[PDB]
Amino acid sequence: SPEQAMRERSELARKGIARAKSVVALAYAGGVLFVAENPSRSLQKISELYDRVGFAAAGKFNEFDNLRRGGIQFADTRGYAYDRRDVTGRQLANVYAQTLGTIFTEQAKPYEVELCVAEVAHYGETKRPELYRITYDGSIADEPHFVVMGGTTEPIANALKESYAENASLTDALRIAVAALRALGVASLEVAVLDANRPRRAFRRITGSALQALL
């Protein structure tokens, strides 16, 4: 009875994911904003995959750390093989979806992780940011505005659907994301951005007095 096994695995994965904290991604005027609750400085849930590709995850740290390392290795190999412009968010999202589906199908215990991949336009180019959401069983969706993962996401989803404006500022977006997450100072918070105005490397980490000044 494959239906019973599939339902039990889905329930286990949902229970595992729902116990994790909430990480949210926003698309403001200058790129993509990542906000997460990280009480530990040593462990991080937001990282960098390539020049214009970001990474965010929620769930067991060891399960998505390996996925992040594999994605970084794959992006580096593909960039060195063809060119640096070959690597895009679509390919990383697709390979992550295939890997998650294979883990869900063949492995004994499914991964209790949620994945988000964000891409920004190259320097001197105009293009709307792209956000992708990968679900534990391999499902892939495209989110035009924002992605909310981890925990009770419904109240935060409603709080973000309301009072959301395009082409906002970094400070305004940061306050909106913080208010949505609360529905929280320098500590227990992790903020990273994908600045499209950077020449080559768009990933940038905000931590310290700069975050307090922005807040």
Partner 1 sequence: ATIVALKYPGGVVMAGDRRSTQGNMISGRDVRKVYITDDYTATGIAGTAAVAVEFARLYAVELEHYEKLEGVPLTFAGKINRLAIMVRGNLLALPLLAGYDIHASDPQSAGRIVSFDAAGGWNIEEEGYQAVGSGSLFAKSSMKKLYSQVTDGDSGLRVAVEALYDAADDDSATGGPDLVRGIFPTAVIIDADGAVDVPESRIAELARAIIESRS
Q: Which residues bind its own copies (CB under 8 A)?
A: 1-3, 6, 8-9, 11-12, 40, 42-43, 60-63, 65-66, 90, 94, 97-98, 101, 105-109, 130, 132, 138-142
Q: Angle at CA 192, nearest 5°, toward 191 and 196?
A: 145
Listed ranges 67-75, 100-108, 152-160, 183-191: which one lies at the site for partner 1 (CB under 8 A): 67-75
Handedness of CA 72, 204, 206, 192 (dihedral sign): negative
Helix, strand, coil shares of the chain, percent, nearest 5, are 40, 25, 35
Q: Which does 83 bind (CB under 5 to 8 A by kind): its own copies, partner 1, none?
A: partner 1
Q: Give the alpha-carbon dihedral of 69, 157, 142, 78, to 10 degrees.
A: -10
CB contact at 8 A, 211 and 189: yes
Residue 69 found at the interface with partner 1 (CB under 8 A): yes
* 82 near partner 1 (CB under 8 A): yes
Residue 80 interacts, among partner 1, its own copies, none and using kind-specific CB cut-offs from 5 to 8 Å, with partner 1
Residue 86 binds which entry of partner 1, its own copies, none, with Cβ cut-offs from 5 to 8 Å by kind?
partner 1
Q: Which of 12, 72, 95, 121 lies at the binding interface for partner 1 (CB under 8 A)?
A: 72
Q: Does 86 bind partner 1 (CB under 8 A)?
A: yes
Q: Give me the least distance between CB of 125 and its own copies, in Å please.
A: 17
183: CB partners within 8 A, 6+ apart? 155, 156, 159
Q: Where are the alpha helices (DSSP H) in 51-192?
A: 61-81, 89-106, 153-161, 170-182
In sequence order, the 6+-apart residues with CB closer than 8 A to the CB of 213 are: none
Residues of this chain, 25-54, that bind partner 1 according to CB under 8 A: 44, 47-49
Q: Which residues bind partner 1 (CB under 8 A)?
A: 44, 47-49, 69, 72-73, 76, 79-83, 85-86, 91
